[PDB]
Amino acid sequence: MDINDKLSIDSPIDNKNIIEFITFRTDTSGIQKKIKAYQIAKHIWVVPERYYAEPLNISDEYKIDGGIYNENYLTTDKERQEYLDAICILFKRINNVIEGKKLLSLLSSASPFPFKDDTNKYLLKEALLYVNEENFEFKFFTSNIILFGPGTNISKNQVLPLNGDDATSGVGSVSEICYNPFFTKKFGEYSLDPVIGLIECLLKSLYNLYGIKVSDDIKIPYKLQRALNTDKYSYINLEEALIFGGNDYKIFTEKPYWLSNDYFLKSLNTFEENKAKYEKDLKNDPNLNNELNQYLQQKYSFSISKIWSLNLTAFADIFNINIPTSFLASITFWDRSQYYKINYPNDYNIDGFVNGQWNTNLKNIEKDNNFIIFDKPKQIITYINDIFNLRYTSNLYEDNLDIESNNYYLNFMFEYDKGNNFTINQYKALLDTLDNDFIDSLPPIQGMNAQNKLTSLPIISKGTDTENINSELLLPIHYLKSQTYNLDMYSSIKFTTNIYEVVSEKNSELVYTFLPHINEIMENYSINNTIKTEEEFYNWMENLFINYSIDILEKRNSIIPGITAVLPWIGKALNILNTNNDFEEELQLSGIKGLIKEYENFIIPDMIVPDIPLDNMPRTYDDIDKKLSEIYTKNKFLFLKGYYFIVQEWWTTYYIQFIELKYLCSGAINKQQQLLITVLEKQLFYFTNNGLFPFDAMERMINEFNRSIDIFSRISQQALNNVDIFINECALFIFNNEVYPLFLNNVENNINKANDNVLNYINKATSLTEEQIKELTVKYTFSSIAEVEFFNESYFKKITNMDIKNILTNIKNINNLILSGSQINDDITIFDESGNNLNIKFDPSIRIVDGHTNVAFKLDKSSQYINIPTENINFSFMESFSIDFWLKILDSTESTTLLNCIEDDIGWKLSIQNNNLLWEMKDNLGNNFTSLFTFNINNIWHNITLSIDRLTNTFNCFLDGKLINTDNISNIFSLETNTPIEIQSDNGAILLEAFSILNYPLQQQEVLNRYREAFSNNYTRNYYGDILKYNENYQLYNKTSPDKEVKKVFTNDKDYIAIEYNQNTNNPTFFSLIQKEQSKIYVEENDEVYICVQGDPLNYITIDNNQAVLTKDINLATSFKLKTNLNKPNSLIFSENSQALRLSNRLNDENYILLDLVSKLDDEPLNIFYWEFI
């Protein structure tokens, strides 16, 4: 059984599963010391001590950029306990999901080949001999992996295999892991999940256990090296690339493969005979095997093709962690190395970070006594200007991946005999073929001997030191430094647009901004007297948000092909294409290539295989059709490996330069944000430090400014998304018409070549078929240029879209809600259609019934409710929103509630007050605003949409697409509250439908559009607004006499229908529509229908001299074509040809119904021709 989780604490005992062993290699002193470990799981051990082998400290020369190297760490029992607790927490979290516990099951039975002369197994630690008594009791405790603490470098989590020789040959190795979970990086405004750091160590160890390691020699191009004046590539290890999957792993693992480097064949081939030997030698059950058959039967049952599919990014998807899938191994190193301590008991539980990945708010590891973050920035660049004394230094940071030249692309060899392998119908999910329960059920190994061939692994690699290179122009990194503020809190800030001002003094209070509106605001702003009341502080904050929103979100539609729109601020932020010319126009003249350093030594593959052999082989239609088919398809494959080859090269040469711009734009935004929060932050501190405002008022401004931070970050993310799209377009554009056209020209030449090759292959031995070649020709003409083409622009979007997503915040679109619903069985569902704020609650007692053009929720009972949380629904004074829905009041109710979003008498609610809508909303400051719509909702479908525009401070209310109040809301500030939006009647029965809350404040024009779209089905409606139904009886009225009902008159020596006055009986006359054919349930516009008057004989409606007399025969009925007009939507027209029904002038207390030619008034006929059903 899995989820073992000993959960052991301290040192209660040192017996049974708790053992004390001797270290494999020697300590730094040069001696092996005894130590104790704890068994977390079957064959899995932990030891909460720093790595014995690695020194507790090293010289400054040997320190790596972004290490810790603190010696007084994990040198106490409480730290050892903290680490122990940290491990079981992480392993429980691994056991939390199904895939995680499948890996741990595999690890428990992934013992390397236990080869023996009837004695031992593979490498392993020793049991205590009872040397306490100096006894010599020998025993071996099984251990597939051993988890140590951090070694010399705390930041480094490396998996050291105790013998690399057998860890490559396929024998395997029980590797030792030195992993530290307490510190993680950010990469943005979110914290990296420690399980990724530990899962990666487990996967690396699993390769060692299976003996499938790449021997450190097999490397792949990952990315063009980040510098100025280098043009080499930074090569990544294949094993790392397999694990750090992301989008870099999808581009080379498509269905047609690449040079396997023999590894994907060597390892598979080595696996074949390793599987073969077990079944024919070890499965013969030698008596000294000690039940290792089952572990080996399960270990060899799993295919390595499934271990390779285990990438580190799909695991992040399983735990639902956000991770930079673009360049996972490198993108985390492109800035100063900063670590944040994780308090595992508190800040990280079985379900990941407690406070979510963004808002966990950990503390920087910077502390005086211990923990020095040794940072050596590769390529410290200092801008130099001899126009005037100006020297502006900036630090660059790069990954620690080793670098090679452009060889891979130059001397890449396509092996023409690489036909498709594996790729059976079945291979596209994780952990498909293994046993969880069966592996778990197997007892552990507790009795046999163990070998020890400790291959030394002391490959010390003192790294490169920094280079101090000058520069003649202001780099983006220089601009980014200008954006940052590096001073006290108790010191002023000065904004400017002249970058040259800031560079003059390195850490002057002055900071550069590329946002004109923001600079204008800060031109006249003193922390002393500009803001003097709470209300003014809020307003200034609102004013900043507005101006900030306007500057960064600015985009214009582009005339460049392949680009929808262009961000004109990118010029002023990173100093790229930043001339006196407009950025739009500079991009025109300079082109898209102006955004990238063009790589001259770009390699385009040649892809020529004209080899066509000849002979007389007469088998299987002389194997001609087959031979040319397999040749045609191999040429298709060869060209496809070339297209795949050219995509990888474009990725690692040209996209890297684009994702890098994404990184640069990312900061540039955040930076400006940081400035805007800081200028606000200093202002708040100015109040507090000088006393000034009281606690109640102070606490509110603090509370509101804290809230506002994520609101800056909301539109900040929105800016990056505009960048994401803009850059991707540019990235695909470079490939589209600068790499692809050159690659197509090679294929076109090879097409005509291979075409001519097959034409030159006419081995027409003995008698020949002159005609048949031309049939063979069309098959293998190679005319299918498009068929061989695999340029699905979708593919490039799939790899480059949201590749670094939610850097600023996880928060999606806000104030977005549609709230539809569906039925299943007798059961219902209610969800956000837009898929935002999906944590909805409701009782299933609610019935879903047809309404106006939709399905409506029937809130009958008071107990019934719909409860919509406000997790991403902001109602701060800086947030404008609107609410839109359709409502019908089922029963005559004077006073009921509909909506409610109020907590402690703060928030907003909508309710019914004496058949009148009552909208009130009141804020935290005690400013109330209330509005009473007195249009007297009377049991009729109504479109209630009402918009709160926080820009102009206007509250608009539209009913049925028509604006009413348009009051001013200026006196009303933030009414954000935690309580959800509640929808319950409380006093009445209502029908609610199409309940939408919108991110922006609607206007008259757009509201009217929304109202009109609700009629686009062209259904006829009764008076109440409900859609008219066939074979349903109604009362007929002329819309001109609401009070008087159309009533039949029978046995008058003429039977007809007419409106009677002084009725006083109003003998209910019920009419129903019926159609001769295609009998439906819902009555659409423009349908042929007859009118049935309910009566004992059940007579129908016909025409006699244009009168509407009642016949009794239905073949004697008249056909009316129903026409509806939007202006009167609860009204019908019974038109035959170009005459419609009309009411006559009063004659004998009776108004007769007759057909009259329709007379209109600007497309809109008289009120008479319109009829209503009830």
mmCIF file of N, CA and C in Angstrom, residues 180-224:
data_model
loop_
_atom_site.group_PDB
_atom_site.id
_atom_site.type_symbol
_atom_site.label_atom_id
_atom_site.label_comp_id
_atom_site.label_asym_id
_atom_site.label_seq_id
_atom_site.Cartn_x
_atom_site.Cartn_y
_atom_site.Cartn_z
ATOM 1 N N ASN A 180 17.018 20.818 -1.777
ATOM 2 C CA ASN A 180 16.597 21.746 -0.739
ATOM 3 C C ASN A 180 15.270 22.377 -1.147
ATOM 4 N N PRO A 181 14.177 22.161 -0.372
ATOM 5 C CA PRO A 181 12.855 22.687 -0.720
ATOM 6 C C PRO A 181 12.461 24.056 -0.155
ATOM 7 N N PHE A 182 13.288 24.621 0.733
ATOM 8 C CA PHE A 182 12.866 25.760 1.535
ATOM 9 C C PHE A 182 12.903 27.060 0.734
ATOM 10 N N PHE A 183 13.800 27.155 -0.256
ATOM 11 C CA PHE A 183 13.966 28.381 -1.020
ATOM 12 C C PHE A 183 13.533 28.143 -2.464
ATOM 13 N N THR A 184 12.739 29.073 -3.012
ATOM 14 C CA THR A 184 12.382 29.044 -4.422
ATOM 15 C C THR A 184 12.503 30.450 -4.997
ATOM 16 N N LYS A 185 12.564 30.510 -6.331
ATOM 17 C CA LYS A 185 12.629 31.762 -7.067
ATOM 18 C C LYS A 185 11.216 32.213 -7.429
ATOM 19 N N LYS A 186 11.115 33.308 -8.198
ATOM 20 C CA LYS A 186 9.836 33.846 -8.634
ATOM 21 C C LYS A 186 9.642 33.776 -10.155
ATOM 22 N N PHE A 187 10.573 34.351 -10.928
ATOM 23 C CA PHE A 187 10.447 34.419 -12.382
ATOM 24 C C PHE A 187 9.494 35.540 -12.804
ATOM 25 N N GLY A 188 8.619 35.962 -11.895
ATOM 26 C CA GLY A 188 7.712 37.054 -12.163
ATOM 27 C C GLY A 188 7.141 37.547 -10.845
ATOM 28 N N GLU A 189 5.835 37.779 -10.840
ATOM 29 C CA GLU A 189 5.120 38.027 -9.607
ATOM 30 C C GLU A 189 4.442 36.733 -9.164
ATOM 31 N N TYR A 190 5.153 35.596 -9.230
ATOM 32 C CA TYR A 190 4.636 34.390 -8.600
ATOM 33 C C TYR A 190 5.771 33.439 -8.270
ATOM 34 N N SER A 191 5.522 32.568 -7.282
ATOM 35 C CA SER A 191 6.553 31.745 -6.677
ATOM 36 C C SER A 191 6.565 30.382 -7.354
ATOM 37 N N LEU A 192 7.765 29.853 -7.591
ATOM 38 C CA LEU A 192 7.888 28.589 -8.292
ATOM 39 C C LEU A 192 7.632 27.468 -7.296
ATOM 40 N N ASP A 193 6.895 26.444 -7.754
ATOM 41 C CA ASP A 193 6.401 25.387 -6.888
ATOM 42 C C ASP A 193 7.546 24.436 -6.572
ATOM 43 N N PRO A 194 7.880 24.219 -5.280
ATOM 44 C CA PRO A 194 8.972 23.321 -4.907
ATOM 45 C C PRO A 194 8.843 21.878 -5.394
ATOM 46 N N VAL A 195 7.614 21.394 -5.630
ATOM 47 C CA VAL A 195 7.428 20.024 -6.092
ATOM 48 C C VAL A 195 8.054 19.851 -7.471
ATOM 49 N N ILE A 196 8.019 20.902 -8.296
ATOM 50 C CA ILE A 196 8.643 20.852 -9.608
ATOM 51 C C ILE A 196 10.137 20.594 -9.445
ATOM 52 N N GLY A 197 10.758 21.245 -8.453
ATOM 53 C CA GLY A 197 12.167 21.051 -8.154
ATOM 54 C C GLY A 197 12.482 19.645 -7.643
ATOM 55 N N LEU A 198 11.515 19.015 -6.970
ATOM 56 C CA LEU A 198 11.705 17.692 -6.399
ATOM 57 C C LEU A 198 11.266 16.597 -7.376
ATOM 58 N N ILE A 199 10.187 16.837 -8.135
ATOM 59 C CA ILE A 199 9.740 15.908 -9.166
ATOM 60 C C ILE A 199 10.854 15.751 -10.199
ATOM 61 N N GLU A 200 11.502 16.874 -10.532
ATOM 62 C CA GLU A 200 12.566 16.899 -11.521
ATOM 63 C C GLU A 200 13.726 16.040 -11.026
ATOM 64 N N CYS A 201 14.038 16.133 -9.729
ATOM 65 C CA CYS A 201 15.053 15.286 -9.114
ATOM 66 C C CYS A 201 14.663 13.801 -9.122
ATOM 67 N N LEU A 202 13.367 13.495 -8.975
ATOM 68 C CA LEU A 202 12.910 12.113 -8.978
ATOM 69 C C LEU A 202 12.991 11.544 -10.388
ATOM 70 N N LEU A 203 12.590 12.346 -11.379
ATOM 71 C CA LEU A 203 12.649 11.919 -12.768
ATOM 72 C C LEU A 203 14.098 11.682 -13.184
ATOM 73 N N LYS A 204 15.002 12.565 -12.740
ATOM 74 C CA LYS A 204 16.413 12.426 -13.061
ATOM 75 C C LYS A 204 16.927 11.129 -12.431
ATOM 76 N N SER A 205 16.464 10.825 -11.209
ATOM 77 C CA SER A 205 16.874 9.619 -10.499
ATOM 78 C C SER A 205 16.282 8.366 -11.142
ATOM 79 N N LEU A 206 15.100 8.505 -11.747
ATOM 80 C CA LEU A 206 14.441 7.378 -12.384
ATOM 81 C C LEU A 206 15.200 6.960 -13.644
ATOM 82 N N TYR A 207 15.786 7.926 -14.362
ATOM 83 C CA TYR A 207 16.636 7.621 -15.504
ATOM 84 C C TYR A 207 17.872 6.828 -15.065
ATOM 85 N N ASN A 208 18.413 7.166 -13.890
ATOM 86 C CA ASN A 208 19.571 6.470 -13.353
ATOM 87 C C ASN A 208 19.191 5.047 -12.954
ATOM 88 N N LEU A 209 18.015 4.885 -12.339
ATOM 89 C CA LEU A 209 17.557 3.578 -11.891
ATOM 90 C C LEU A 209 17.327 2.642 -13.076
ATOM 91 N N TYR A 210 16.848 3.179 -14.204
ATOM 92 C CA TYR A 210 16.616 2.381 -15.401
ATOM 93 C C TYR A 210 17.868 2.292 -16.279
ATOM 94 N N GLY A 211 18.936 3.009 -15.905
ATOM 95 C CA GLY A 211 20.196 2.936 -16.626
ATOM 96 C C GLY A 211 20.149 3.691 -17.953
ATOM 97 N N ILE A 212 19.117 4.522 -18.126
ATOM 98 C CA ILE A 212 18.957 5.322 -19.326
ATOM 99 C C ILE A 212 19.406 6.746 -19.007
ATOM 100 N N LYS A 213 20.714 6.980 -19.105
ATOM 101 C CA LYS A 213 21.268 8.316 -18.990
ATOM 102 C C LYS A 213 21.999 8.620 -20.292
ATOM 103 N N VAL A 214 22.088 9.906 -20.631
ATOM 104 C CA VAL A 214 22.592 10.324 -21.930
ATOM 105 C C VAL A 214 24.108 10.546 -21.886
ATOM 106 N N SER A 215 24.737 10.206 -20.749
ATOM 107 C CA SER A 215 26.186 10.177 -20.590
ATOM 108 C C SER A 215 26.795 11.564 -20.772
ATOM 109 N N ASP A 216 25.949 12.602 -20.734
ATOM 110 C CA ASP A 216 26.386 13.988 -20.686
ATOM 111 C C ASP A 216 27.010 14.438 -22.013
ATOM 112 N N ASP A 217 26.953 13.598 -23.057
ATOM 113 C CA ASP A 217 27.647 13.879 -24.307
ATOM 114 C C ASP A 217 26.656 14.226 -25.412
ATOM 115 N N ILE A 218 25.411 13.772 -25.247
ATOM 116 C CA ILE A 218 24.389 13.920 -26.265
ATOM 117 C C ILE A 218 23.619 15.199 -25.959
ATOM 118 N N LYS A 219 23.795 16.228 -26.794
ATOM 119 C CA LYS A 219 23.279 17.551 -26.475
ATOM 120 C C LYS A 219 22.422 18.051 -27.637
ATOM 121 N N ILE A 220 21.568 19.037 -27.345
ATOM 122 C CA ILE A 220 20.641 19.613 -28.308
ATOM 123 C C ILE A 220 20.781 21.125 -28.233
ATOM 124 N N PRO A 221 20.705 21.867 -29.360
ATOM 125 C CA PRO A 221 20.581 23.324 -29.303
ATOM 126 C C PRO A 221 19.286 23.762 -28.624
ATOM 127 N N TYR A 222 19.394 24.687 -27.660
ATOM 128 C CA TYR A 222 18.260 25.135 -26.864
ATOM 129 C C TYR A 222 17.925 26.580 -27.218
ATOM 130 N N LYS A 223 18.933 27.457 -27.165
ATOM 131 C CA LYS A 223 18.711 28.874 -27.388
ATOM 132 C C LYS A 223 20.020 29.572 -27.765
ATOM 133 N N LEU A 224 19.890 30.568 -28.643
ATOM 134 C CA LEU A 224 20.961 31.498 -28.935
ATOM 135 C C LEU A 224 21.429 32.146 -27.632
#
